[PDB]
């Protein structure tokens, strides 16, 4: 079967991270939309204009709003993209056939929205040469960050080629986890986000979303299906592109 | 010898086009700077804020201004990048060891600044699915454009892989040739731009900067050295990256 996949990048990244996976999925006959979230990729906004993860998710929400009645999509989120999925699901669950988490955070409904992010920071506290700054928006102090090039090279693009890593150094932009804002955000709902089918994809070779963290997430909020990719690194859409496409094809054949 | 190369992308593009060549040059021991020109790549400005090719060249001029006395660089421009080189050379010729034109426009000093652009439009008048728009800046009507995806696929990324072409569809932004502004701009000078060493690199397999145009440019303004790369396409920095690096190494060993 064919599906319409909506690929969602993580903070500081952009649609460009999906430049290898998108054409491969299309070669299988699928429709693919790779969005630039707010202040990401070539989006015109700067991070200082964004005050929450919900505002950051605007392009995704706007895209889902534009889907005609009856049309469903399969969301695919990498790393922090899982939060955009949860936010989108509490507004457009009826338009989501399933959500695929790709070495991604897996929010739940029993704990506050920042729960898995707080845990991630516990498991991976040292972001190396990553730099931080602060700005104010809607009366709240937000902590922005710019991923360090060494962190990118050693923990995210670990086994990626120098040509891929170069794109990261050239294209990554300032962003934010909006951690303190997530902490005060209403919980994700059971009727919305809680109702969607969730497929968890990961590799134990991820050097940032470590095994301890991912296995902790799986136990914390049981996915409907779990796919473990052998080898590769954090960026499976670059190092195991074919494998990811094969998994997504199976998801397309399972959920609609 | 080692040199400091400053790579300059063309309109609608960004530093990302050099993601393959930059690391290869560094692997040879060189210093490489790949800039995002105004309203290009991840630069925060939008094209409507730019009123001329000179303003568009700001990042390059600012970079050259920051070079301490005595430090020289080798400029490498692709396509329309040749115009940024000419503009930069009339302000910082003493900091330019040489300029390399990569399937690029080659402005001269005997005709007005838009001369080669006007000729290019004569040789390649149909930009296919490219779209146009207009905006006003500093009392002048500027024609903006967004490169068509079909034009990109068939004429620029002709022999590039689908993964490279995907980056173009995801990252290319609105831009402008500022043709009418160039037409009224003071001529490039013989003392500045005219004095720098110019190396012309090209392939007769370029599907947009056609042989007729490039051979016309070479006859119009004789380069100090000409390198013809066999095969490949318009984007030699992607299809003949190794070849381009080898040529640039020779340039580094010849001009300082």
From Swiss-Prot, chains A, B:
Inhibited by hexafluoracetone and rhodanide (thiocyanate). Also inhibited by trichloroacetaldehyde via a covalent link on Ser-79. Susceptible to several serine, histidine and cysteine inhibitors: is strongly inhibited by diisopropyl fluorophosphate, diethyl pyrocarbonate, HgCl(2) and parachloromercuribenzoate (PCMB), to a lesser extent by iodoacetamide (IAAM) and iodoacetic acid (IAA), but barely by AgNO(3) and PbNO(3). This is (S)-hydroxynitrile lyase. Its EC number is 4.1.2.47. InterPro entries: AB_hydrolase_1, AB_hydrolase_fold, MES/HNL. The record marks 206 as: Increases basicity of active site His. (S)-mandelonitrile binds at residues 10, 79. The active site is at residues 79, 234. Optimum pH is between 5.3 and 5.7. Acetone binds at residues 10, 79. GO terms for biological process: jasmonic acid metabolic process; salicylic acid metabolic process. It comes from Hevea brasiliensis.
